[PDB]
Design a binder for this molecule. Structure first.
Ligand code: SF4
Ligand SMILES: [Mg+2]
Ligand SMILES: [Mg+2]
Ligand SMILES: [Mg+2]
Ligand SMILES: [Mg+2]
Ligand SMILES: [Mg+2]
Ligand SMILES: [Mg+2]
Ligand SMILES: [Mg+2]
Ligand SMILES: [Mg+2]
Ligand SMILES: [Mg+2]
Ligand SMILES: [Mg+2]
Ligand SMILES: [Mg+2]
Ligand SMILES: [Mg+2]
Ligand SMILES: [Mg+2]
Ligand SMILES: [Mg+2]
Ligand SMILES: [Mg+2]
Ligand SMILES: [Mg+2]
Ligand SMILES: [Mg+2]
Ligand SMILES: [Mg+2]
Ligand SMILES: [Mg+2]
Ligand SMILES: [Mg+2]
Ligand SMILES: [Mg+2]
Ligand SMILES: [Mg+2]
Ligand SMILES: [Mg+2]
Ligand SMILES: [Mg+2]
Ligand SMILES: [Mg+2]
Ligand SMILES: [Mg+2]
Ligand SMILES: [Mg+2]
Ligand SMILES: [Mg+2]
Ligand SMILES: [Mg+2]
Ligand SMILES: [Mg+2]
Ligand SMILES: [Mg+2]
Ligand SMILES: [Mg+2]
Ligand SMILES: [Mg+2]
Ligand SMILES: [Mg+2]
Ligand SMILES: [Mg+2]
Ligand SMILES: [Mg+2]
Ligand SMILES: [Mg+2]
Ligand SMILES: [Mg+2]
Ligand SMILES: [Mg+2]
Ligand SMILES: [Mg+2]
Ligand SMILES: [Mg+2]
Ligand SMILES: [Mg+2]
Ligand SMILES: [Mg+2]
Ligand SMILES: [Mg+2]
Ligand SMILES: [Mg+2]
Ligand SMILES: [Mg+2]
Ligand SMILES: [Mg+2]
Ligand SMILES: [Mg+2]
Ligand SMILES: [Mg+2]
Ligand SMILES: [Mg+2]
Ligand SMILES: [Mg+2]
Ligand SMILES: [Mg+2]
Ligand SMILES: [Mg+2]
Ligand SMILES: [Mg+2]
Ligand SMILES: [Mg+2]
Ligand SMILES: [Mg+2]
Ligand SMILES: [Mg+2]
Ligand SMILES: [Mg+2]
Ligand SMILES: [Mg+2]
Ligand SMILES: [Mg+2]
Ligand SMILES: [Mg+2]
Ligand SMILES: [Mg+2]
Ligand SMILES: [Mg+2]
Ligand SMILES: [Mg+2]
Ligand SMILES: [Mg+2]
Ligand SMILES: [Mg+2]
Ligand SMILES: [Mg+2]
Ligand SMILES: [Mg+2]
Ligand SMILES: [Mg+2]
Ligand SMILES: [Mg+2]
Ligand SMILES: [Mg+2]
Ligand SMILES: [Mg+2]
Ligand SMILES: [Mg+2]
Ligand SMILES: [Mg+2]
Ligand SMILES: [Mg+2]
Ligand SMILES: [Mg+2]
Ligand SMILES: [Mg+2]
Ligand SMILES: [Mg+2]
Ligand SMILES: [Mg+2]
Ligand SMILES: [Mg+2]
Ligand SMILES: [Mg+2]
Ligand SMILES: [Mg+2]
Ligand SMILES: [Mg+2]
Ligand SMILES: [Mg+2]
Ligand SMILES: [Mg+2]
Ligand SMILES: [Mg+2]
Ligand SMILES: [Mg+2]
Ligand SMILES: [Mg+2]
Ligand SMILES: [Mg+2]
Ligand SMILES: [Mg+2]
Ligand SMILES: [Mg+2]
Ligand SMILES: [Mg+2]
Ligand SMILES: [Mg+2]
Ligand SMILES: [Mg+2]
Ligand SMILES: [Mg+2]
Ligand SMILES: [Mg+2]
Ligand SMILES: [Mg+2]
Ligand SMILES: [Mg+2]
Ligand SMILES: [Mg+2]
Ligand SMILES: [Mg+2]
Ligand SMILES: [Mg+2]
Ligand SMILES: [Mg+2]
Ligand SMILES: [Mg+2]
Ligand SMILES: [Mg+2]
Lengths: 96, 69, 208, 99, 82
RNA sequence: UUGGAGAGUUUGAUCCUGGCUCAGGGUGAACGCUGGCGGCGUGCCUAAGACAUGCAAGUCGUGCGGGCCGCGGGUCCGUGGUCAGCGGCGGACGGGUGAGUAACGCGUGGGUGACCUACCCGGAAGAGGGGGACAACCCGGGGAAACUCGGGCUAAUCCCCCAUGUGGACCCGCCCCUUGGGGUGUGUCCAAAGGGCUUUGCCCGCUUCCGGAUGGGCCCGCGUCCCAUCAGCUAGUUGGUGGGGUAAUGGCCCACCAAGGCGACGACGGGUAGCCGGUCUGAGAGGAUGGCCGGCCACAGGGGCACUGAGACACGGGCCCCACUCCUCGGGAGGCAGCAGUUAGGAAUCUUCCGCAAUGGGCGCAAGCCUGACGGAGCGACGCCGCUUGGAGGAAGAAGCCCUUCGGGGUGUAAACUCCUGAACCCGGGACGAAACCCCCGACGAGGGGACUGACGGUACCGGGGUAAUAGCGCCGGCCAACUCCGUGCCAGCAGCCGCGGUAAUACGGAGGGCGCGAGCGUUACCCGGAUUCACUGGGCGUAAAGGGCGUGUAGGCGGCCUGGGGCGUCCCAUGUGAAAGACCACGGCUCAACCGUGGGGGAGCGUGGGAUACGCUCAGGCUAGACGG
RNA sequence: CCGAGGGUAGGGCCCGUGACUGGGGCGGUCGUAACAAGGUAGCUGUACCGGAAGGUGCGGCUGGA
């Protein structure tokens, strides 16, 4: 029968929603970008990769991703996109 | 035996009223006690350790045996 | 607190005039003179051969009863001794004697330690012009054992100070009379003091 | 320092990993007498070059797997299959300590 | 943040602090980082303060902040004099 | 070289073996009889049973917009109370408990090229532009409450995009360096937020990056209880390749390949237990213990779970299942192992107190607000320490009582009695703990100066006056200190071991006397001791308990004389670590002590470097006295 | 998918309890096995028998003659 505890709880839910929201789009984009590398679609990959790349670090700005996290995400997005394209090359534009 | 007198209550028709004292010639109920039974005198701590007049009368009239099966 | 009861009986059991009564001790009216056997119904009974425990027991109560002190406090002093450097028995008598209330008696301010203890507990004494009433004040080399100078105009310090103008406080003490003071200069040597006490029998007791 | 230790390879039947048995000696804390005791270390051999007999030094390293926390440092001696028996003949002997 | 404050010792009605460096979120009288000198608010002996001013500077430099009465006995024996 | 005592009981008697028993020290104690003062400690060991009631975490108007109360005057603006709300930081600290846990949990020493750290502090750069959502409040359903719902307007240090890129991040390459450490080049990727006053500048804020500081996470060696009448265990099992997950290594999780991993140096299983600093005992070695205090861990009625966050899988946050309880038909409510308190269990364990004055924590610029942390107070001989119930004189010795050979003996200078002091009380004064935060000069800095504030507390202590003023408990055959008379008559009873009681009991019960302790004395429980009776120190086996019925041999333990290399053990010096409290030595504060403060001395043990080589070890040669052979 | 836990079924260990029964300890009835060559030397492992102690066979031991 008291608090501003519930005020905190109140907040977290608003927060949670946002972390979850950005988090989704990253996965969705990374996966999408990666997907394109398995067919490549060299241009289109990087373009998305770029957008993935960016949405990643962007989320590391707040309480959503740790820096070392976003650092890992990109580190793997990247390796994956380049390596797939190693099967039938043509890297243009740029992200590597 | 010594005994702490925590709270003092008057019992009304509908509610229990707390009261900080209970003067002489009056009745009420004290919360806190632990060893006190009925017909037991009770004195403030630094006072004459008098024992009130007891009471005393009738011896039981009917007798029944009980067997612990 | 202290022993407080019939005190001659102490001496009569112990087979040694302990000079507890002070003023009376030297009188032919002391008890040890008229009957120097043990107190109670069985003294004139031809005494029986004493065990080693007894022998050290009796020896111990002897020392203890002298300084008129609680077996608690006695033992704790004694323990301090053993752990303290060098010769236990000596350092014992030392600390036993470095205690206040008994000083006051050594300096004849009062007749007996009993009377002394009273004097000390009553504020009638001061070490160093600070008023001190605790009879267990271990006095240390360098202390000024005053009489309270507001206690000065008092029939009994006088009487006893008066019979103390030129007798000899032992080698470790220095009664500037008249001015009521005196001093604790040295913790005693073993030789410094004779009491009817085998300093060693007592150590052998607390060894059991 | 990263603890270095020395011992024999008793199992290489794993894949990029060798079992290194390590003796140590110390005096009995109550009875003085020196006593031997031992411990088998799962040890990282990334280039599979170590084999039965090979007394080696292994070094305290960061975790590689559950229970591999040492990698082999340097080959120190070779072909000590006498120590290898000294440990098989003990193991083997177990089949008659049952009921 | 890391702090300089009075860590009480002594006994009841015998305060006997021990101005000290320790992580803010310790018990008052719990494991400190370094003892940099005592303090006897009652003034019972000539030494009712001896800040190791050599040390007490090193801290203040690297972060350590202090009680509004840690500094009181830190100023009192001048760790601040220009 | 500061340290070491033993007794009783097996016989007719003795010696030996051997068990039992006792004196001692200790306690979070409890019980009996008894009980005056005070100081410091300390006080649910049981049901980690269940809890009534209050309280225990909030703060900021100097991030923002609002609903009501006012106050100077022209339904206005201003400002400060005020209730929320959005928003920040805190709520992960601090407080409680020992249930679980035999574990890298703890201890101790290391590793992290495998890592994170809000605030704090150093240093480098920056703060341009545009946009947008939800509460509040207005509108309207439901409820008996919890209280909720849908629609509509709205601010910001809340929310997003573009630019700026000191710098950071990631892919590839290259230089150094060796596990993912530092540099560099191209591509790509990412920053922000304003408020305030005395207003051409200071104060608090926000952004990215580097370093510091403190705090952590993860990993490794070594130490950590009882049962082998628990002997075999193991499929995420052990290893690998790839990937997910994380701040980060890892079978942490997943798919595939391999067939492994562990065990008599005790795996697996069963029991019991939080560990340590320490505590107690002990001559020591050792044994035993882990309450109070300090450190780590684990837990928040029983389970599971994640969210928010720098940090939690969060004690007084959230979700879900379970048990229980309470409230008056859709549902709701609760979680004292925080402080007090209740109830229950128990041999047993406290006040529903006072104050934020001090110390410390949160928030704010500050004033300040919050703090059952804490500072104190109350109760309890629970423990230890101080203190009192008096001191001097007072008979060849009153009365009563005990004894008696009847003469006497004892209690006993004890009492009475003289006198001296003067606990309590009565009056008068009366604290230290508190000098900072803030205001003033300076420069919001250095130094200076001024002011407010005390729960305990009218207490301690001081000063004056001032009455003789509580004693009890255990024992008195031997161990073991203390003896007589009656009562009793294997009865009543004592009893720790011997044993005592059957008419003359120093052994039962009372008395007088005595011995020991004394606000205590005893008793029961338990730990260590005597127990050299688990023997390392420091024991034994022909007949006392104890040589396997006899071999042969596995592991293991042990191993002749000489020379040499190593230096693993072992010895030595250096160095780091070995927190604080404790213990020890010194001094010092409370009148003393208990209590407490300051300084000193450190050791084992482990890390690191240097050194020695005799003994043991290993390696290398030689020997023939052991051993085998001809 | 995993998942508190609920449920079905079969196992392992522990503890309590149970008509009755087995001996063990503690506080009259039968005989006389042992202790003296104990009146048959004693003891022994085993075996068969016997109200009971025990007796007897076979071997062993001397701690017997
Ligand atoms: S007087 Fe005699 S009997 Fe009384 S004490 Fe002085 S010495 Fe002993
Ligand atoms: Mg999708
Ligand atoms: Mg997060
Ligand atoms: Mg981040
Ligand atoms: Mg006077
Ligand atoms: Mg002793
Ligand atoms: Mg691996
Ligand atoms: Mg002894
Ligand atoms: Mg006997
Ligand atoms: Mg016999
Ligand atoms: Mg006999
Ligand atoms: Mg014996
Ligand atoms: Mg002893
Ligand atoms: Mg009692
Ligand atoms: Mg007090
Ligand atoms: Mg108290
Ligand atoms: Mg409890
Ligand atoms: Mg306990
Ligand atoms: Mg309630
Ligand atoms: Mg508000
Ligand atoms: Mg927080
Ligand atoms: Mg536990
Ligand atoms: Mg286990
Ligand atoms: Mg371990
Ligand atoms: Mg460790
Ligand atoms: Mg935070
Ligand atoms: Mg707007
Ligand atoms: Mg940008
Ligand atoms: Mg798998
Ligand atoms: Mg991997
Ligand atoms: Mg990885
Ligand atoms: Mg696993
Ligand atoms: Mg892997
Ligand atoms: Mg397979
Ligand atoms: Mg082992
Ligand atoms: Mg269990
Ligand atoms: Mg437990
Ligand atoms: Mg011993
Ligand atoms: Mg603790
Ligand atoms: Mg749990
Ligand atoms: Mg839970
Ligand atoms: Mg509970
Ligand atoms: Mg729960
Ligand atoms: Mg919480
Ligand atoms: Mg929770
Ligand atoms: Mg937890
Ligand atoms: Mg709670
Ligand atoms: Mg409570
Ligand atoms: Mg009860
Ligand atoms: Mg209570
Ligand atoms: Mg309390
Ligand atoms: Mg406060
Ligand atoms: Mg404060
Ligand atoms: Mg309060
Ligand atoms: Mg007391
Ligand atoms: Mg006392
Ligand atoms: Mg006469
Ligand atoms: Mg008489
Ligand atoms: Mg007479
Ligand atoms: Mg007298
Ligand atoms: Mg008078
Ligand atoms: Mg003051
Ligand atoms: Mg100014
Ligand atoms: Mg007064
Ligand atoms: Mg006075
Ligand atoms: Mg009198
Ligand atoms: Mg006694
Ligand atoms: Mg005795
Ligand atoms: Mg005797
Ligand atoms: Mg007679
Ligand atoms: Mg009778
Ligand atoms: Mg008796
Ligand atoms: Mg008699
Ligand atoms: Mg007789
Ligand atoms: Mg008697
Ligand atoms: Mg007796
Ligand atoms: Mg014992
Ligand atoms: Mg022993
Ligand atoms: Mg034994
Ligand atoms: Mg031995
Ligand atoms: Mg023996
Ligand atoms: Mg025999
Ligand atoms: Mg033989
Ligand atoms: Mg056999
Ligand atoms: Mg061999
Ligand atoms: Mg040799
Ligand atoms: Mg050998
Ligand atoms: Mg060496
Ligand atoms: Mg220490
Ligand atoms: Mg002093
Ligand atoms: Mg010290
Ligand atoms: Mg050779
Ligand atoms: Mg399941
Ligand atoms: Mg199940
Ligand atoms: Mg269910
Ligand atoms: Mg059964
Ligand atoms: Mg016969
Ligand atoms: Mg015969
Ligand atoms: Mg026969
Ligand atoms: Mg015979
Ligand atoms: Mg036969
Ligand atoms: Mg028959
Ligand atoms: Mg027959
Ligand atoms: Mg025969
Ligand atoms: Mg014979």
């Amino acid at each position: 029968r008291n608090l501003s505890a519930l005020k905190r709880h109140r907040q977290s839910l608003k927060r949670r929603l946002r972390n979850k929201a950005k988090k989704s789009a990253i996965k969705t984009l990374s996966k999408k970008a990666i997907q394109l590398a398995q067919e490549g679609k060299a241009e289109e990959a990087l373009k998305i990769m770029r957008k993935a790349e960016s949405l990643i670090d962007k989320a590391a700005k707040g309480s959503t991703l740790h820096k070392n996290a976003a650092a890992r995400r990109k580190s793997r997005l990247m390796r994956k996109v380049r390596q797939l394209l190693e099967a039938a090359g043509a890297p243009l534009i740029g992200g590597g | 035996r010594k005994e702490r007198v925590a709270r003092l209550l008057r019992m009304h028709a509908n509610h229990r009223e707390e009261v900080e004292e209970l003067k002489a010639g009056d009745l009420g109920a004290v919360v806190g006690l632990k060893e006190t039974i009925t017909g037991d005198t009770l004195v403030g701590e630094d006072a004459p350790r008098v024992i009130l007049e007891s009471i005393e009368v009738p011896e039981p009239v009917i007798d029944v045996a009980i067997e612990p099966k | 607190g202290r022993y407080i009861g019939p005190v001659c009986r102490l001496c009569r059991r112990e087979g040694v005039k302990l000079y507890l009564k002070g003023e009376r001790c030297y009188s032919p009216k002391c008890a040890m003179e008229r009957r120097p056997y043990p107190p109670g119904q069985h003294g004139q009974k031809r005494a029986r051969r004493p065990s080693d425990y007894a022998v050290r027991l009796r020896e111990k109560q002897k020392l203890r009863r002298i300084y008129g002190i609680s077996e608690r406090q006695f033992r704790n002093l004694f323990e301090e001794a053993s752990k303290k450097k060098g010769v236990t028995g000596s350092v014992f008598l030392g600390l036993l004697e470095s205690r206040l209330d008994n000083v006051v008696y050594r300096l004849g301010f009062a007749v007996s330690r009993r009377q002394a203890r009273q004097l000390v507990r009553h504020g009638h004494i001061t070490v160093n012009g600070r008023r001190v009433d605790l009879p267990s004040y271990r006095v240390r080399p360098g202390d000024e054992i005053a009489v309270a100078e507001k206690s000065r105009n008092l029939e009994l310090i006088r009487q006893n100070l008066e019979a103390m103008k030129g007798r000899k406080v032992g080698p470790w003490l220095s009664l500037d009379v008249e001015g009521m003071k005196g001093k604790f200069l040295r913790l005693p040597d073993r030789e410094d003091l004779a009491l009817p006490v085998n300093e060693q029998l007592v150590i052998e007791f607390y060894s059991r | 320092p990263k603890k270095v230790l020395t011992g024999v390879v008793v199992s290489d039947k794993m894949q990029k990993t060798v079992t290194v048995l390590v003796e140590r000696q110390f005096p009995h804390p109550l009875y003085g007498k020196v006593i031997k005791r031992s411990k088998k270390y799962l040890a990282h051999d990334p280039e599979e070059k170590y084999k039965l007999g090979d007394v080696v030094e292994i070094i305290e390293s960061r975790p590689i797997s559950k229970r591999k926390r040492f990698r082999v440092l340097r080959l120190v001696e070779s072909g000590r299959m006498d120590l290898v028996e000294k440990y098989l003949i003990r193991r083997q002997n177990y089949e008659s300590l049952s009921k | 943040m890391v702090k300089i404050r009075l860590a009480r010792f002594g006994s009841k009605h015998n305060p006997h602090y021990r101005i000290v460096v320790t992580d803010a979120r310790r018990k008052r009288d719990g494991k400190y980082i370094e003892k940099i000198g005592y303090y006897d608010p009652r003034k019972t002996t000539p030494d009712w303060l001896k800040v190791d001013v050599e040390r007490a500077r090193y801290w203040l430099s690297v972060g350590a902040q202090p009680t509004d009465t840690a500094r009181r006995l830190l100023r009192q024996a001048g760790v601040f004099r220009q």
